[PDB]
């Protein structure tokens, strides 16, 4: 699980 | 699961 | 689990 | 678990 | 567990 | 457990 | 447990 | 346990 | 246990 | 200029 | 200029 | 200029 | 200039 | 200039 | 200038 | 100038 | 100038 | 000038 939140 | 949120 | 929050 | 919060 | 909080 | 709080 | 608080 | 508090 | 308090 | 490279 | 490199 | 490099 | 390097 | 290097 | 080096 | 070196 | 070296 | 060296 990789989560990138910008 | 890869999630990219811009 | 990698979480990046900007 | 790696968490980066900016 | 690595947590980076800026 | 490594915690960095700025 | 390493804790860095600035 | 290492704790750094600034 | 090492504690640094500034 | 927005560049997304995966 | 925003650059995202994965 | 924002640069994200993973 | 913000640079994030992982 | 903010630089984050992991 | 803020520099974080891990 | 703030420099954090781990 | 603040310098933290671990 | 604050210098912390561990």
Residue numbers in the entry:
A (entry chain A), B (entry chain A), C (entry chain A), D (entry chain A), E (entry chain A), F (entry chain A), ...: 1 to 6
Paper text:
Curli proteins are produced via dedicated and tightly regulated cellular processes, and their fibrils mediate host cell adhesion and invasion, lead to immune system activation, and scaffold bacterial communities known as biofilms. CsgA, a 151-residue protein, consists of five imperfect sequence repeats (R1-R5), defined by regularly spaced serine (Ser), glutamine (Gln) and asparagine (Asn) residues. The first and the last repeats (R1 and R5) form amyloid fibrils in isolation and are critical to CsgA seeding and nucleation by CsgB, while the other repeats (R2-R4) contain 'gatekeeper' residues that temper the amyloidogenicity of CsgA.
However, while 45LNIYQY50 (R1), 47IYQYGG52 (R1), and 137VTQVGF142 (R5) formed unbranched and elongated amyloid-like fibrils, the 129TASNSS134 (R4-R5 loop) segment formed scarce and more amorphous structures. The 45LNIYQY50 (R1), 47IYQYGG52 (R1), and 137VTQVGF142 (R5) segments bound the amyloid indicator dye ThT and demonstrated dose-dependent amyloid fibrillation curves with short lag times. Both segments, as well as 137VTQVGF142 (R5), adopted a classical amyloid steric zipper architecture, with two possible dry interfaces between paired β-sheets. The β-strands were oriented parallel to each other along the β-sheets. These three structures are class 1 steric zippers, as defined by Sawaya and Eisenberg according to the organization of the β-strands and β-sheets. Specifically, the R1 45LNIYQY50 and 47IYQYGG52 segments and the R5 137VTQVGF142 segment formed fibrils that bound the amyloid indicator dye ThT and formed canonical amyloid class 1 steric zippers. These segments contain Gln49 or Gln139 (marked in bold in 45LNIYQY50, 47IYQYGG52, and 137VTQVGF142), which are critical for fibrillation and cannot be mutated to asparagine without interfering with curli assembly.
